[PDB]
Amino acid sequence: PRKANLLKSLARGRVRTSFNKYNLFNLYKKGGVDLKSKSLYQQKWTAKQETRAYHGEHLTEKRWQTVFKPKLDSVAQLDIKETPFLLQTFAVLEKRLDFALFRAMFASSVRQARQFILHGNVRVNGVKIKHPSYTLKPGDMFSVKPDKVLEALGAKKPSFQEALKIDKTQIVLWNKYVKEAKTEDPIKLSELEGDEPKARKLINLPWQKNYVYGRQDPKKPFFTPWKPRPFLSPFAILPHHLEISFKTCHAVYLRDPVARPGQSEVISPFDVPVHERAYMYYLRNGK
Amino acid sequence: MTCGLVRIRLARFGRKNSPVYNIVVANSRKARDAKPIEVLGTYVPVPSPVTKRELKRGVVPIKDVKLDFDRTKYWIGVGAQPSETVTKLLRKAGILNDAWATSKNS
């Protein structure tokens, strides 16, 4: 239920609701969904085979085909350009808590968002909702455990060997700096592996206060000093219908996604015609 | 303890754990869930849980009852037999005298 021909597959040129770089490659290694040699069906299929992979990846086809709502909300609230109406095709997903959690960027992927909700990290209106299927409603604040948000917006703790390798190479570079300064002390290996504090104290650098890179805090199972997760800006989209507070790791479902002249609250990396072909396909119940 | 030609019983439409009872008036011959003469309301078996902090405080979980107080009149008067629970409900709600007590262990 999470593999197929690969979710993060450079070969599977499909974008996912994630922050992974193999997913990022496919964000940039892709032009417009090819739709100029295909017929209606193949045109509809390409759209679906593409929109779903990002707009509702976890959800099953049976479920989505029941979740998808023919009538859409696009009346542009107090706001001339044309309203991307069919860009609200997957608004029901944006309404869902798990999808909105990725929109709030408190989880690396909508799948990780579902997991965070399952763990009980996601709490809506102070209520520990453990159901990713839950659909957020206007005025529903959804908060995720700060450590889980740190995990989502930070790198993972490297293995102690990896931390030593980073330091020993940096120590060699530090020795090179000292040697270069002369032209203008290496630490141990197995002994360091013997004890994390022993290595941490032995490996001291101007920045390293007796600690190892990535494992500065052994108690934290997140990279330390919390190296910020990369490949975040490429997918750093903040919805106006979804309040986000990274500082407090809190988010609020302000309102259901509403389309406006040349604007759609739905975070869609797919063009309106791409959404249109997929929407058309779902309109006939995926026929 | 409350049986007669015309009676007020609790129709069963709730699922497991919480079989929400339905305060309904039905004839003795008529079955409990058989379309009753009139449906006064529905009495939940489980008291609707209040805020856990409120539960710790004076506030107590309260069951949601749709009992139509004014409606039972047409039946209490004509002469129905409300289930002991309903009988008590009427007594407690002030629908009828608390003396409608059946002097049971309660």
Next chain:
Amino acid sequence: RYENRTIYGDIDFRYHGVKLHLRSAKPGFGLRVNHVIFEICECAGIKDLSGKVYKSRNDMNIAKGTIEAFTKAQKTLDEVALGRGKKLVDVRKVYYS
């Protein structure tokens, strides 16, 4: 075109054998018509239409037929007005959805 998205009014032009019956739809209703009518509508601009082809769905004839409908049985609002000697009006903007 009406409001630059759909036809002006429901039509029924009969081209040769194909009997097209396209109906204008509310802003939003996507392009819902025969594959061919879709690609014509995709290139014409119509992005909110709906209809059906009865006796003989002659693919190509549907295409000749469709563009014929757009130019023959789709009199714009102005014409209706100037001709009848009156002035018809648009009420959807008078509401500002």
Next chain:
Amino acid sequence: SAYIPGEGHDAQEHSIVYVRGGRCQDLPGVKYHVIRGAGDLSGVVNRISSRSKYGAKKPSKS
């Protein structure tokens, strides 16, 4: 009149089978097919794909 599918059958006069639906297109007569996987009919050997339609249990391995 039925048709036996798959490459290999155990049609023994007097066997009992389970008859199914389907045309034989070529055989101008067999308007009913049979199930290679019930009664006395068997399951083609080494049948590697579409096994269900042709009767066979996941050829397991050692």
Next chain:
Amino acid sequence: HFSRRRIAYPFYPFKKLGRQHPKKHDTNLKTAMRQFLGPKNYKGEYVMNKYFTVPTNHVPNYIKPDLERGQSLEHPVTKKPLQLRYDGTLGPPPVENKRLQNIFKDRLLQPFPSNPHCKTNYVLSPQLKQSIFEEITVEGLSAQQVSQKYGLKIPRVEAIVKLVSVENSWNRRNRVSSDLKTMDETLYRMFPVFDSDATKVIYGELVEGERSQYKFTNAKVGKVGYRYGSGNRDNKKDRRIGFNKLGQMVYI
């Protein structure tokens, strides 16, 4: 042909592969992303990539390999552009990628490198959130009027009210982890900032020495309790899955 649809080879031209070592056993889609990436560093990350680390000035850094064709390995310190040379030594290009120098002004706020209709909403300023929290608890002039007075949508300002109050509670409790004490600063600088000019139930009885745990609700016969029938669509695929006040998925 008319559909085919095969591998997602980079739309932009990318150095391919040739006469591979018999053991190399490699793939093109891998080399492609590999070039979208830069010689991996000891640290294990990528010292250089058009957008490797994170922006720091309100101006977002969304993937624009569209304008810059495909080359995307800028210098970390000199923010200076480079490209891969014949042998394989990173080095500058002989032609400015163009457009990427004068990037269409607003375009910067276009997350996806395709949809021209999805734009990141600039973050709210500290002063706005601060001033806003006070306005409510001081006089709370019509949020409707105050939102008009402050552009932010009516349910926008009201949402801040709860957020700031919670933020204040967190500040008093200092719960804000040293992480947030900084992480937030980076988020504040990955996007821009706005505000730049422009009689209910039956229970009236003695609730002492009695109590209405068995609380009730008045209604009128005819339109009242459950209905006989209502084919419980429980064998169907559209069941009413409500959520328990306690926190549990519960059938209507």
Next chain:
Amino acid sequence: MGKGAAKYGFKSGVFPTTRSILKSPTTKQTDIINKVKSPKPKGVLGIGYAKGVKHPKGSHRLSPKVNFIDVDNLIAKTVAEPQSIKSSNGSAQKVRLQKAELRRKFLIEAFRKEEARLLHKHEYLQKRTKELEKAKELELEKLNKEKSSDLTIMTLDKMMSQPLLRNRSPEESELL
């Protein structure tokens, strides 16, 4: 979902109708009296009968008038006040008597409340229909007033003004 349910706001739900405690038209409707008594239109309408046709004897020739129940009169006919005072010297007996008169008092209220329901039905709705009479004339109120452009339609008034068909005058036929 039943297309029927849909019509009635989808979620509908069939429910045995709750009959009003009042079972028949009341005597408190002295107009209903003549409303269900005053002469019937024995004409085109089958309502009534044919004067010439002798009705089958033993059959009420005209529709039998529905009995008008007297709410207060019956209230006690159904449940009057006990004859003795506290004839009972036994508690439970007194409680049962009280529980008793208590059940009669609710019936007394039900009859009166149901009569009030019937009263406003022919009173409040009647005076609320008065506002309908006046509110409707407002439909043509803003419309009938001469609209800036009314000369356009009023251009062939002569055609209607001229006698389209005057047939023939007496003598005019005579000469013919």
Next chain:
RNA sequence: UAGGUAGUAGGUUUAUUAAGAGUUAAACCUAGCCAACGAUCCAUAAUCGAUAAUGAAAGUUAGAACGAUCACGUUGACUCUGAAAUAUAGUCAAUAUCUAUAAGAUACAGCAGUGAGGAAUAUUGGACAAUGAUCGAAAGAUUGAUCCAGUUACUUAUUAGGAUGAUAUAUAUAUAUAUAUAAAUUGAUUAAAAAUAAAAUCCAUAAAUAAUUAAAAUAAUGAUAUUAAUUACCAUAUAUUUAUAUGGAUAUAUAUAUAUUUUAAUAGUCCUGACUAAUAUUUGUGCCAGCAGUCGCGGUAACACAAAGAGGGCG
């Protein structure tokens, strides 16, 4: 099935009936009444909804399930009872089994269950704790209604793990880490991949373990029931989800300066000529062998047979 109808059609007057009527019974008139807008006759079928399905809608289908109506409890008839029954009664007969010979008894279309029929449909379960029902003044008795569990993917639903990741070595703030040593699978000779795919790392929880203990119901009584949940040494209440502080729990070296149970991961199935998404090829066969909804496909390089790789569906 074209003529049907003789109590038939109507009229009148009696019988009985709570009661009108050929409704019966009776008596007597008259000549009707129905029918090609389908009579009479035959066949099939329990009926229906604010129930279920399908569609754009009219509709169309169903009748399991919810619920309403009917009708029957092996067949037939009749009779009493009784407000109301041709009563799952009785009566006599009919059919088929027993106590082992009665002017006998039974009839599972009550619940379990068995044999049969069939493509195909469950436990010889637990409890009266709840909601009803009958008896009783009450005490409380009965309750295969009912409520619960059991079997069965029949249906729905929800879960079924993320993050990060294409080698490994040896040397030598930042920053263009930097050489070298090699190896380095499955295809592949380049727009031919498999493949972030596996792998270590990494991070949790499900479960496992204490603790626990709500609520269906109370006057008490809970069958379910390993309760559901909560839940991590505790209370103690703090304060804001949260926190510190206190003692006890538990703490070692030699009472406190902290620890404060443990913890994983795993999908099939169908298709890939077109219809109809499925280009990385290849192989075997030889109009055979097989496939095939439809077009058709198989005789010398088969995209359609049977496979491999690769891939696309549903899950």
